Design a protein around this ligand. Sequence first.
Ligand SMILES: CCN(CC)COc1ccc(Nc2ncc3c(n2)N(C)C(=O)N(c2c(Cl)cccc2Cl)C3)cc1
Length: 340
Amino acid sequence: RPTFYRQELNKTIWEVPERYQNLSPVGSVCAAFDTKTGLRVAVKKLSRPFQSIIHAKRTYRELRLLKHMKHENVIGLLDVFTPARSLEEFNDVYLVTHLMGADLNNIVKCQKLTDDHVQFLIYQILRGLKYIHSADIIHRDLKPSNLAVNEDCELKILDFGHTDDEMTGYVATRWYRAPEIMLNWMHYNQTVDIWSVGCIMAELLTGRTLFPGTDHIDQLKLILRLVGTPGAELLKKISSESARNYIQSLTQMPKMNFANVFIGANPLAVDLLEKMLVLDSDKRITAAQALAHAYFAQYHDPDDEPVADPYDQSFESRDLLIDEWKSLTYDEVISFVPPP
Ligand SMILES: CCN(CC)COc1ccc(Nc2ncc3c(n2)N(C)C(=O)N(c2c(Cl)cccc2Cl)C3)cc1
């Protein structure tokens, strides 16, 4: 058990192992320097981790997820600790990850990137996503602000999956969401993430948001105008009779010519975009198939695009008491083993 020291950071008391020095607030979260590894890190102190069933299960969920992800393009766990000496005294949870420079959103917003630049960034997103999906995990909330990238243009996927108010109106919180998930059309798959990737890729190519809807319905119109209104085949997969019914009230529209939308773009980028932005999620290209697309010929290496070990999330189906979620969380904290 290391030695911990106390420090108040904005009306917040932090108690962390001596190895972590020079803590400074960044959002709760502090950047620090881990003298044991020589790594600049981000330290998050969870706010009231076990105040309710929903919160206790959320804490367990986040810890299980982070402990599982071990990939260069996905945020992983460097350390997790509690100053608590036993389960009875257990109340706080601190999570340590690599400190990232800035998110994609804060970096290239309103800016058109070069094609080589787009290839590299999207390739890394797809490499991370192939790893995540292989574990049967769905990000569900990919957006430029959940993608961090350093100077060398190295990228990590962060913040896996929301307040209905924050999804209302002209907001980036909904612009990258697959239509089937935005309007709850059905039980969704992992290709919801691919739709997100297409929205991101287009924005990097044009410097412009692909479907900046002013609300849910305006966004659906922007989408259908580009990809076309649904055909009979997809209509049947929409479990919601009301949703299905609303869809049918719309004037039919054919899919637009993508080369005429992304004018001047690499023809290979245009082709991949058409394969990612397919309305019927059963037909979208998967992350693994995309990595093999000729657009990434310059980066693709089948021997350097690993998959994840199986991820047991049967716990999502369980209804336990706070003390039970708390005890499971504690076990995950003490059984933690740092990466090499
Ligand atoms: C205008 C306000 N400024 C202050 C100057 C804030 O700007 C920042 C603040 C931090 C960073 N880098 C940064 N790298 C890694 C993480 C992270 N922030 N954050 C915030 C987390 O929460 N991380 C995290 C997750 Cl996603 C899961 C579990 C544990 C952690 Cl620590 C990682 C970049 C810009």
